[PDB]
Amino acid sequence: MIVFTDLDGTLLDERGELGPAREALERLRALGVPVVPVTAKTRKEVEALGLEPPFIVENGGGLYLPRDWPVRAGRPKGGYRVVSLAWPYRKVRARLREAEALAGRPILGYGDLTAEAVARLTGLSREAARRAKAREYDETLVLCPEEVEAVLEALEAVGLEWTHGGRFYHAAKGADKGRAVARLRALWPDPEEARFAVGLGDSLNDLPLFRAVDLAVYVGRGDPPEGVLATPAPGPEGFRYAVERYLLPRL
Amino acid sequence: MIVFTDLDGTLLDERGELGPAREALERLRALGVPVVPVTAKTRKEVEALGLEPPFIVENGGGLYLPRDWPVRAGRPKGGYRVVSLAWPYRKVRARLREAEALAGRPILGYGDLTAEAVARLTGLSREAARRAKAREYDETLVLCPEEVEAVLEALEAVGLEWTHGGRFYHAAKGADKGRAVARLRALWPDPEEARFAVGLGDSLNDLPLFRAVDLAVYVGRGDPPEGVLATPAPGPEGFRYAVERYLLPRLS
Numbered sequence: 001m002i003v004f005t006d007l008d009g010t011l012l013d014e015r016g017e018l019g020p021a022r023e024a025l026e027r028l029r030a031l032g033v034p035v036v037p038v039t040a041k042t043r044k045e046v047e048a049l050g051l052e053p054p055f056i057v058e059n060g061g062g063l064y065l066p067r068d069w070p071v072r073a074g075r076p077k078g079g080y081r082v083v084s085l086a087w088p089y090r091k092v093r094a095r096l097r098e099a100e101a102l103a104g105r106p107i108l109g110y111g112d113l114t115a116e117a118v119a120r121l122t123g124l125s126r127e128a129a130r131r132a133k134a135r136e137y138d139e140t141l142v143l144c145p146e147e148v149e150a151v152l153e154a155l156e157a158v159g160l161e162w163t164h165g166g167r168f169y170h171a172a173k174g175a176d177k178g179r180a181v182a183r184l185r186a187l188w189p190d191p192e193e194a195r196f197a198v199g200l201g202d203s204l205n206d207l208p209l210f211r212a213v214d215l216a217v218y219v220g221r222g223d224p225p226e227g228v229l230a231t232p233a234p235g236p237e238g239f240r241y242a243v244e245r246y247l248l249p250r251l
Numbered sequence: 252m253i254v255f256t257d258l259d260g261t262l263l264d265e266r267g268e269l270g271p272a273r274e275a276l277e278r279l280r281a282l283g284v285p286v287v288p289v290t291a292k293t294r295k296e297v298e299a300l301g302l303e304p305p306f307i308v309e310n311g312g313g314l315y316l317p318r319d320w321p322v323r324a325g326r327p328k329g330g331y332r333v334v335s336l337a338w339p340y341r342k343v344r345a346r347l348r349e350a351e352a353l354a355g356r357p358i359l360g361y362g363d364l365t366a367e368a369v370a371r372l373t374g375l376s377r378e379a380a381r382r383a384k385a386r387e388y389d390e391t392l393v394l395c396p397e398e399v400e401a402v403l404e405a406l407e408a409v410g411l412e413w414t415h416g417g418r419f420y421h422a423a424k425g426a427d428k429g430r431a432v433a434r435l436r437a438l439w440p441d442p443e444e445a446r447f448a449v450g451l452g453d454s455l456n457d458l459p460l461f462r463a464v465d466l467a468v469y470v471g472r473g474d475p476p477e478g479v480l481a482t483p484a485p486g487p488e489g490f491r492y493a494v495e496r497y498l499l500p501r502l503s
């Protein structure tokens with residue numbers, strides 16, 4: 001069993017972990033169940049949250065492995081090997097400039113904003129905002145609710161893809177959580193451990209993650225998508241719930 | 252006679268250059284008629300244009316005088332004395348956060364943007380954008396057309412004042428081109444010289460300028476403000492026309 005989790009509102013929601021979630025996390029760790037973060041966040045953000053690879057960043061744009069992973073894949077980088085699945089940020093930013101021309105209006109994202117601006121808009125600290133700005137693949141957009149559609153059509157017109165992360169639209173090419181999960185499972189050292197994958201997500205828009213695992217659990221508010229399990233409560237209690245009810249009785 | 256003039260859309264051409272206005276300005280100088288820029292631009296932008304004090308920056312937020320101005324006012328800063336009329340930028344920026352909470356959506360200004368983004372948004376060079384970001388009083392807002400109504404009401408709700416410079420909305424408190432021109436006229440070393448004021452402008456933020464002068468001339472696009480003089484063509488050609496048709500005859 002491998003457990004894939006969107007940080008977002010599955011594990012984090014309230015900033016970082018939280019009582020019930022921690023307890024559930026330790027439980028998994030004690031049982032030798034690998035837990036793999038799958039997040040919109042950057043590698044700099046995940047590191048600051050003290051997480052060790054493997055993890056999936058920027059909506060599936062990048063798969064980070066320990067440098068000594070038993071399966072040779074990706075490019076060596078310090079204590080990591082990085083599997084790049086998506087176009088680099090600089091290329092995404094260049095295409096965004098083409099999109100603006102098409103939409104005949106400015107398209108702003110984190111690349112255009114100061115860290116203090118990003119911090120204000122996200123509720124992050126300036127320090128965490130700086131890490132959220134350190135993007136390798138995916139751009140977080142700041143769009144006027146009223147102009148979202150014109151912008152999205154322009155993005156696709158220039159070959160970019162878009163997703164919604166919970167509060168912001170994102171632009172990238174090749175970044176998909178399901179693709180990244182399938183890739184990491186195919187790169188797993190022990191094929192039997194990766195045979196059964198669980199995916200926990202806090203977004204009605206985590207379908208790519210939900211599609212790529214064998215047991216999908218939606219830990220948010222309201223009804224889950226079709227073919228996806230639910231929990232009574234959202235947040236860390238929803239994560240703990242799902243862990244205690246769906247997982248522990250399998251190990 | 253003192254001629255008070257906006258820069259963007261008035262004395263500057265569409266690309267921000269003084270070239271086209273030079274001949275008209277040279278007529279005024281020869282005739283010994285003072286010309287005072289009254290602009291949305293910052294001090295650093297006015298300096299980069301090679302303009303000398305006195306001048307009024309940031310929609311009337313600050314009055315810049317020569318260090319040796321005969322009438323003592325404001326505070327020293329090397330070659331300048333500065334009369335601050337409006338709240339400092341830091342206070343406007345903090346108040347904008349309350350406006351943003353009230354609107355329930357982001358309200359972005361230059362202060363939130365890199366020089367590179369400001370350059371892209373304005374068509375300025377990166378270097379000119381750094382100068383435009385060096386704001387002391389007034390914030391330039393970057394609003395999508397659909398959110399303007401809600402944004403301007405949120406500004407008013409939190410005690411900020413708004414205006415528009417021809418291309419962008421602005422937020423400040425106490426920054427008013429008419430207030431600043433009136434203050435400058437009162438600080439003028441030659442009351443007879445200051446007795447008759449002319450004001451040229453093209454945008455919303457210039458209506459207060461028009462009200463603070465004795466002869467107002469609109470060189471913007473479309474129809475002029477009620478009872479204000481108009482010119483055949485906008486911008487610097489409008490400025491030149493005004494000098495030749497409206498000002499010269501009066502100087503004789």
Ligand SMILES: O=C(O)[C@@H](CO)O[C@H]1O[C@H](CO)[C@@H](O)[C@H](O)[C@@H]1O
Pocket residue numbers: 008040041042045122124132140164165166167168169
């Ligand atoms: O799209 C969002 O709503 C969130 C969560 O999905 O991701 C963005 O926003 C987060 C802050 O809320 C950042 O930490 C991420 O890097 C990213 O910029």
Ligand SMILES: O=C(O)[C@@H](CO)O[C@H]1O[C@H](CO)[C@@H](O)[C@H](O)[C@@H]1O
Pocket residue numbers: 258259290291292293296373375383391415416417418419420
């Ligand atoms: O509001 C505008 O239309 C213009 C008019 O001067 O001013 C803003 O925009 C100008 C760039 O177009 C900057 O030079 C100014 O500092 C200010 O940010």
Ligand SMILES: [Mg+2]
Pocket residue numbers: 257258259260261416417453454
């Ligand atoms: Mg103007």
